[PDB]
Amino acid sequence: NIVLTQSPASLAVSLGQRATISCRASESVDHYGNSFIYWYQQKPGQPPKLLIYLASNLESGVPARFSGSGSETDFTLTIDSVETDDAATYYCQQNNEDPYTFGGGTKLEIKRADAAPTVSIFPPSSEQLTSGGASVVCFLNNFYPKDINVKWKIDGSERQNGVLNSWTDQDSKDSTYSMSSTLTLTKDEYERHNSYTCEATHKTSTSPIVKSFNRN
Amino acid sequence: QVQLLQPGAELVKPGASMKLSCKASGYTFTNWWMHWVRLRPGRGLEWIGRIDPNSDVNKYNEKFENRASLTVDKHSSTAYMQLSSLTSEDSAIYYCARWFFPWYFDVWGTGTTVTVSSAKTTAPSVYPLAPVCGGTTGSSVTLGCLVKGYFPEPVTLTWNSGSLSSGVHTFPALLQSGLYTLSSSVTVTSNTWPSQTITCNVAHPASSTKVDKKIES
Amino acid sequence: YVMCTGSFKLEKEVAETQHGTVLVQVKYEGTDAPCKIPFSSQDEKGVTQNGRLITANPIVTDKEKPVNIEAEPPFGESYIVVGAGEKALKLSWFKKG
């Protein structure tokens, strides 16, 4: 089987700047003078979409800023000026021999200017309380870059257990990221304590932005 | 107009078998080969096999050869793929794709999210998230909606029946205790809330439920 | 150049040369000349199957002029593929040895 290895695993490029992704094959994918390799673009919630075929040929409808090159075992995809909607995962694929194989995938980010997260904290709903559970939610919206860390405290004591985190993919409109963090407790444990604190640490913030509430 | 239609979701037990459909339209079904490809989370795309609908000639990925079966129904212009001895490793999004002979895949199916589980169907709980009674800061207020404890994926969440789409962030689901949880935030100007009405609406087609929740307090 | 987009019609019978190669002469039915001619060889199951081109690079200079192509196909049963898309020309060939 022809193995396709992509490099790098992921990268972030400033809007309007050039991006380059490489794909290397464990052996030749050339067939009668043509490279049987293809470049696809896939966005979250969407099926893949062809960008480049036969190494260098542009599919109709694909913007001219997209281009491809290479032969035998070494190939490259280039976007000479990235845009917001260019944020996606990119895959190379070969069909020179069965079974068809795909590269490991390269994730492209769009490096808008850094932005501190907007932090909002939300106590459990009365409705949830009626069912006997108690989830506290903290939204961290429109920050960049992706790396961020959240710390929970209950009455000044750090809480590690019961924390679940999630991050959105890059926003199609503003190139920002968002994060939701949920600390889940029982109602009984929850009603024993007073102050609850969510702390967001990010590249843009040396001393973290902190949001808290008192249940009573 | 060319269309390759697949069912939105499948819930199958481990070791069991499944049969996924791809209904082609807008072209001569038997004029193009059909391939099948799956996308696993953090594991990329994987090729399963191909079939020529005209002659029923086919080819499998050797990894799947003992486990897979490609068939077609010309009458309905539908291609089928069957896979048995399913495990959790087979949980993925399955796409059918039309082969632009002899090169690339020109048209991709809608995709079928396949879950291999023995879990049972569970309706979501929907909770409104209103701010702290001492948390009303800022020229613009932010509200939220929490959808907890459902199965299987997916759910669809909208705000004001879709009339309100800007300034919204809807977060990816998360498997916990064998159930999914997700959340969504919306940010509006203080002039909008609590002055104007805002409701979270959540449909869960797997349980055939739909639930509206007004944001109070 | 870009790859030819049009359709192909077979102009002559396929012929085996003295030295186990084939000469194929085809007539182009496209509008995008000049363009590069899609050419590939496979088997019955659609599997890409190795071989080599004797002709440098097959190109349609003038859509009204037929192009000759000499190639060394794989041994045994194969399909010569001229063009691309649904109307792609598929011609069966056997090379003993």
Author numbering:
A (entry chain L): 1 to 30, 30A, 30B, 30C, 30D, 31 to 212
B (entry chain H): 1 to 52, 52A, 53 to 82, 82A, 82B, 82C, 83 to 100, 100A, ...
C (entry chain A): 299 to 395
Question: What does the published report state?
Answer:
The ectodomain of the DENV E protein is composed of three domains: DI is a central nine-stranded β-barrel domain, DII consists of two finger-like protrusions from DI and contains the hydrophobic peptide required for virus fusion, and DIII is an immunoglobulin-like domain on the other side of DI that has been proposed to interact with as yet uncharacterized host receptor(s). One such DIII-specific neutralizing MAb from our panel, DENV1-E111 (henceforth termed E111) potently neutralized infection of a genotype 2 DENV-1 (strain 16007, EC50 of ∼4 ng/ml), but inhibited infection of a genotype 4 virus poorly (strain Western Pacific-74 (West Pac-74), EC50 of ∼15,200 ng/ml). Here, we determined the crystal structures of an E111 single-chain variable fragment (scFv) in complex with DIII of 16007 and the E111 Fab in complex with DIII from West Pac-74. E111 bound to a previously uncharacterized epitope centered on the CC′ loop of DIII, which should not be exposed on the virion according to existing flavivirus atomic models; our structural data defining the CC′ loop epitope of E111 was supported by extensive mutagenesis and binding analyses.
